[model samples]
Target chain A: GLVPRGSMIMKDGIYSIIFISNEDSCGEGILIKNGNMITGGDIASVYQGVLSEDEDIILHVHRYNYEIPSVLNIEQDYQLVIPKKVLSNDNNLTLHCHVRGNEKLFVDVYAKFIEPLV
Target chain B: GLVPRGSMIMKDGIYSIIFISNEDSCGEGILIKNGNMITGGDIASVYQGVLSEDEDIILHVHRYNYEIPSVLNIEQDYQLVIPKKVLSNDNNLTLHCHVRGNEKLFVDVYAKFIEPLV
Candidate 1:
């Protein structure tokens, strides 16, 4: 039985965000995680999401174009779905997600653990 | 002759912070970079500093111990001297610094571009 470990998860804090493209390109940013809710952004985009069934992370990406061509390469806003298993305790924790409607395209994430929100 | 690029430099923004140990262990945090000024911290510490001569970045690290053993492993408050040349435009910008009084023991940093401080 694949027991959902959601209840055992203790990820509640801020995280340094790094986005990796399949081509190996990378982008950096920040992320805040509280309970089942998640939110944060890079210069080019802001995103928010929630943990579902202790198994998946869902996010809605929004772009504000803080820079003409922001340092981050998140070109457009979209929904991202990630598996919860990827959230590890490693200093450089990694998570992977597939863009909505495009399973063929996935984005790799490095969610380095930061401080807990006080 | 090496002309200091102080006037030509244009880095003023927020960056996701990651500290790397010589042993390759990693810690993550947040950093604010405003013109020549710098300040930010992880749960364990808060630091403030400035970019001098566009050649050096000096920081004073202070620990607050937000967590019993915060996500960041900053042991105590100390002064840090970093060469500005390490500040690259790569997706994962890197910086290196020597711990005060312990030139042989240095820390590596990955300051990922997050956003503008607007």
Candidate 2:
């Protein structure tokens, strides 16, 4: 008999990732530093670029309650950052952030291949 | 025997782009102003009308890491202005934004296409 995974079992899962540029063009990608990406199958991708003394980037995740098969759930809230080195460019990019059962999850993004006005 | 083109070889890969106005009511279009439209597929289509500033118009773009790709990507953000030459009719027209991409892109973007407000 195949054993089914329980809600609490799946709720405790966590995956960490570090996305390095595979190309020279200012490569960029996303990561789930905390919580989950599933939000009614809709997630918001929040980001920031080149922060100053008064500027900083923030990421937020909220959780909720569910029932039935318990296939969808957000266990907790968390935040992460794109080191200054990654944000060499001055612009900030945001995308709709959601995914299916996790794959390598490399989101192919484009940035100024050349230096532009900051 | 055929050798593959190196990544650096593809570095100089510049492709010509021709974006014909797929739809035309106001009728407007333009040429590439700067770097590759590939500047973060999050491109912006700046639109405006022959109008007044009391109308409110502005546009800007920022870039950061790829949070995640939502089917509908607002490549670039924009604001359009429409004239406000008051008449007995006091007719005021304001240009708005529109977009399309990815199958599930229109997941929850349904709104009014007529007068008053959007």
Candidate closest to the true structure, highest TM-score: 1
Candidate 1 is graded, for docking, as incorrect
Angstrom error of the Cα, residue A7, model 2: value is 40
Fraction of the native A-B contacts that model 2 recovers: 0.00
Residue lDDT tens for model 1, B1-118 = 2232331153655566678766566666666555575656654555667677745566776665544453324466677886656545533466668776677667787766655543
- Which CAPRI category fits model 2? incorrect
Cα deviation in Å at residue B35, candidate 2? 29
Q: Candidates' TM-scores?
A: 0.46, 0.24
Clash pairs, candidate 1, are none
Compared with the true structure, model 1 gives a TM-score of 0.46
True contacts kept of each: 0.00, 0.00
Worst 10 residues of 2 chain B by lDDT: B109-118
Chain B only: TM-score of model 1: 0.76
